[PDB]
Design a protein around this ligand. Structure first.
Ligand SMILES: CC(=O)N[C@@H]1[C@@H](O)[C@H](O[C@@H]2O[C@H](CO)[C@@H](O)[C@H](O)[C@H]2NC(C)=O)[C@@H](CO)O[C@@H]1O
Ligand SMILES: [Cl-]
Ligand SMILES: [Cl-]
Ligand SMILES: [Cl-]
Ligand SMILES: [Cl-]
Ligand SMILES: [Cl-]
Ligand code: NA
Ligand code: NA
Length: 129
């Protein structure tokens, strides 16, 4: 599924991401925009052979099992394919674990490079939330 911006904002808000670990909702929407262009089916292969999955491009090196990232962890205890669902619950729940792990949203490269330090509230501007 390719979410609309506000649709995703609302979904993320419903799933408890607004101000989760102090990260306002716009951060999460911004991260999803730049990680996946709001596409739950986005996948991208990393240089190490892991793959990033889903709307928040959660990687299989650490967070999910895709059966083809040897030596990797599955800290969200999910098949990576679960992160491609139109239902963002698995991605959100895994993202909550990630963002809680001490590094905040810096885990999301696109967030660090494209959202951090920007007016992320713009990402939820106009949305009914
Ligand atoms: C939370 C999450 O999974 N974020 C992704 C990053 O992990 C990806 O960065 C890449 O991650 C792999 C596995 O840890 C690293 O081997 C690789 O160096 C790293 N790539 C960069 C440029 O840092 C990122 C890839 O775009 O996608 C999500 O942000
Ligand atoms: Cl868009
Ligand atoms: Cl915000
Ligand atoms: Cl694996
Ligand atoms: Cl959802
Ligand atoms: Cl933080
Ligand atoms: Na990415
Ligand atoms: Na893994």
């Amino acid at each position: 599924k390719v979410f609309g911006r506000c649709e995703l904002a609302a979904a993320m808000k419903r799933h408890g991401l607004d101000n989760y670990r102090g990260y306002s909702l716009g951060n999460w929407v911004c991260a999803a925009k730049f990680e996946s262009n709001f596409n739950t089916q986005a996948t991208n292969r990393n240089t190490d052979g892991s793959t990033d999955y889903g709307i928040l491009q959660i990687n299989s090196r650490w967070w999910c099992n895709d059966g083809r990232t040897p030596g990797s962890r599955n800290l969200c205890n999910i098949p990576c394919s679960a992160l491609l669902s139109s239902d963002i619950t698995a991605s959100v729940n895994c993202a909550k674990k990630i963002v809680s792990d001490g590094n905040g949203m810096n885990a999301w490269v696109a967030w660090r490079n494209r959202c951090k330090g920007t007016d992320v509230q713009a990402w939820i501007r106009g949305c009914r939330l």
